[PDB]
Design a protein around this ligand. Structure first.
Ligand SMILES: N#Cc1c(NC(=O)c2cc(S(=O)(=O)N3CCOCC3)c(Cl)cc2Cl)sc2c1CCN(Cc1ccc(O)cc1)C2
Length: 454
């Protein structure tokens, strides 16, 4: 990250006197205090607690300067109106300065995403960086841009949406060279009206793209009214300008041929949607000067990720939502709001299994309690706490919640009521019930869900 503080304070609009602190060359940018090294820029956001609380801690860890929405004593800080807003600006500007080729992608669905596939393909010929894990939103994307290894030639960004209009924001930020739109099978929906609003919001991806730029989009008539008018649009799907003309799915592997490819392709994956992901990633890669030779070979040794946490289903038809990704409180908070923001199925309730989060040192217990502000009795019918540090939160909830709507289960160096946890959960869960399971990946938590999908 080739950035200095004085430069950061220009682009960012610093509200304070900046030439007071030395203009040092920054290193890494982080919002999670635990990740700060020497020379790092702290960016304090509205999480479970406000970032600014950990400005103190960030410099103990070696931060050289931090973004701030207030006066900060004897520490290099940049004064601004909205740290997040500042943070976006900073990312836009860094793209404009390094001038990397950005490839914008949507829908995470499969065992391997179009974001993963494409990066992997581009990596055979060019120096490539990409979105890590699920950092695809108004926090996630800036963060990626600012973590780009010095010299990256191509950058595959994934962009996702919570509300309509979010992708517009990022396509405007990133001003992509090329974009891919894919469609992920529906739940009973999120904060959206229908598949239409969704597709409308998804198609926004080209808002920040130049004329005659390349955009792939589904054969599906639903995207029709939302196509750009001055772009190079290449549709994929049965009967379209690109289609898989044959397919074989084995136990683990999968072979297929695309009309515009002279040879078959081989992936160690399964599901028709993975072939479609492979083809389109495969087609843009051709546009960027990668040989079909180099591509067959790359697919040879492909990388399955962690299952990009959608909904699954237990052995009674009840909707599970297990979120492995991001072990940290703001992520606990965010999902709780997502979970409870969703409507419950008809004649079916809303359970939450929360488990100890880790690596919170001397703040664990404070931070676990903080979750209470995201726990409504209105929406959440039963709430199951497992672990130790969750304790007081379990207590808090038992106060705020109707009698016998809360269960606690111990886990320490002296006892492990896991056996009982399971017994309880498998009594609470019904054929129309939605269940969240969030907390540090542990042997015991992973152990639980397989018994549910038994
Ligand atoms: N609030 C809060 C905290 C964090 N929040 C986040 O990491 C965070 C995570 C997320 S996120 O949900 O993980 N997000 C990342 C990218 O976009 C998709 C999902 C977001 Cl969007 C925003 C934030 Cl600010 S990380 C963190 C805290 C407070 C506690 N922490 C450790 C700590 C322990 C003891 C101390 O004394 C100091 C710090 C680290």
């Amino acid at each position: 990250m080739k950035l200095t503080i004085h430069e950061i304070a220009q682009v960012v609009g610093a509200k304070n006197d900046i030439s007071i602190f030395e203009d040092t060359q920054l290193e890494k940018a982080e919002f999670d205090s635990r990740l700060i090294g020497t020379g790092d820029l702290f960016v304090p956001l509205k999480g479970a607690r406000d970032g600014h609380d950990f400005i103190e801690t960030a410099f103990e860890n070696g931060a050289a300067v931090t973004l701030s929405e207030k006066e900060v004593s004897n520490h290099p800080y940049i004064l601004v109106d909205d740290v997040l807003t500042a943070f976006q600006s900073l990312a836009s500007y860094y793209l404009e300065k390094t001038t990397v080729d950005v490839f914008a992608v949507t829908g995470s669905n499969g065992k391997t995403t179009t974001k993963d596939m494409l990066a992997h393909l581009l990596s055979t010929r060019y120096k490539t960086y990409k979105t890590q894990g699920n950092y695809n939103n108004e926090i996630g994307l800036p963060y990626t841009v600012l973590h780009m290894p010095e010299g990256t030639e191509k950058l595959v960004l994934e962009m996702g949406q919570d509300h309509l209009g979010d992708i517009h924001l990022l396509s405007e930020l990133a001003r992509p060279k090329t974009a891919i739109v894919t469609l992920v099978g529906e739940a009973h929906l999120a904060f959206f009206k229908d598949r239409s609003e969704i597709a409308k919001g998804k198609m926004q991806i080209a808002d920040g793209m130049a004329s005659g730029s390349l955009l792939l989009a589904p054969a599906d008539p639903i995207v029709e009214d939302y196509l750009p008018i001055d772009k190079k649009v290449v549709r994929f799907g049965q009967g379209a300008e690109l289609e898989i003309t044959d397919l074989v799915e084995r136990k683990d592997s999968l072979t297929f041929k695309a009309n515009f490819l002279e040879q078959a392709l081989d992936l160690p994956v399964t599901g028709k949607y993975n072939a479609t992901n492979a083809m389109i990633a495969s087609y843009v890669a051709l546009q960027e000067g990668v040989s079909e030779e180099q591509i067959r070979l790359a697919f040879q040794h492909l990388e399955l990720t962690r299952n990009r946490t959608e909904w699954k289903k237990a052995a009674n038809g009840a909707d599970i939502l297990s979120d492995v990704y991001n072990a940290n409180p703001t992520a606990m908070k965010l999902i709780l709001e997502t979970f409870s923001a969703i409507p419950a199925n008809e004649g079916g309730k809303k359970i939450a299994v929360l488990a100890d989060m880790k690596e919170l040192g001397d703040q664990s217990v404070q931070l676990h309690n903080q979750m209470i502000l995201s726990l409504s009795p209105d929406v959440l019918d039963i709430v199951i706490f497992y672990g130790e540090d969750i304790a007081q939160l379990a207590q808090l909830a038992s106060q705020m919640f109707p009698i016998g709507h809360v269960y606690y289960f111990k886990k320490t160096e002296d006892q492990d009521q896991f056996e009982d946890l399971v017994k309880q959960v498998k009594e609470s869960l019904g054929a129309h019930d939605q269940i969240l399971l969030k907390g540090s990946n542990s042997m015991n938590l992973a152990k639980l869900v397989e018994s549910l999908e038994n």
